[PDB]
Design a protein around this ligand. Structure first.
Ligand code: NAG
Length: 246
């Protein structure tokens, strides 16, 4: 398991949580010096647990699939909540067994279905550490509409930061003031599956991507990514989704 506490958090302690989350995901090889996530894991070993706490100290446990860094569901006191999707239903076989009742949320866990339930897209939802406190507070008591927005905040501030060093840095600057996500942030989140696949293909192709990936940079401008020498590969992406899962 891994943990993070909003009470007393600063850029350094959040960076430490993100390093832990990364090191909890298993791999048997690296590809261009970057961990390759597993094709598959059987049983309960498939799921990682994250314990998160708000400023007031109240908590949820979030179950994460280690092959792909997807959130399956979470436990809030005695009620489990799972996304309405087969991977989550399978997960509900293995995690939060204890719960008194199991609510299936009235949406799956992809960004597009979440944004619809929330009533706004994530470019308009401020993120940061204060926003993560608010998210944890909302998920504590079921309100399916409020929960969708909170889930959008949680996914980005955890799984997305683990995937990209830049996204982790962005949350760090928002340690004490929320701000909607930078354009580069939304771009990387959207490109993770693509980048993972292109990096894997590059082995056997002299480090060259079979298909280039379009992104937004730190200054708000486009870049196009063509090979492994790019700083997105050398100095940003931290985890690769196995092509067996794409
Ligand atoms: C590869 O990467 C860098 C961009 O980081 C670029 O300057 C270079 O021209 C690219 N070369 C090839 C052969 O793909």
């Amino acid at each position: 398991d891994v943990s993070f506490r909003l009470s007393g958090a600063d850029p350094s302690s959040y960076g430490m949580f993100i390093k832990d989350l990364r090191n909890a995901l298993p791999h048997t090889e690296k590809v261009y010096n970057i961990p390759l996530l597993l094709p598959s894991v059987s049983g309960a070993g498939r799921y990682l647990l994250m314990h998160l706490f708000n400023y007031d100290g109240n908590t949820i446990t979030v179950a994460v699939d280690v092959t792909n860094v997807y959130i399956m569901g979470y436990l809030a006191l005695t009620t489990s909540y799972f996304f309405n999707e087969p991977a989550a239903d399978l997960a509900s076989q293995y995690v939060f067994r204890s719960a008194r009742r199991k609510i299936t949320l009235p949406y799956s866990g992809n960004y597009e279905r979440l944004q619809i339930a929330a009533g706004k897209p994530r470019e308009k939802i401020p993120i940061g550490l204060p926003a993560l406190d608010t998210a944890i507070s909302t998920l504590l008591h079921y309100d399916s509409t409020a929960a969708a927005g909170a889930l959008l905040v949680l996914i980005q501030t955890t799984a997305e930061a683990a995937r990209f060093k830049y996204i982790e840095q962005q949350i760090q600057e928002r340690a004490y003031r929320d701000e909607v996500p930078s354009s580069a942030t939304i771009s990387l989140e959207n490109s993770w599956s693509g980048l993972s696949k292109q990096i894997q293909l590059a082995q056997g192709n002299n480090g060259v991507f079979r298909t280039p990936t379009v992104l937004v940079d730190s200054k708000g401008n486009r870049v196009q990514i063509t090979n492994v020498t790019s700083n997105v590969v050398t100095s940003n992406i931290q985890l690769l989704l196995n092509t067996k899962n794409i």
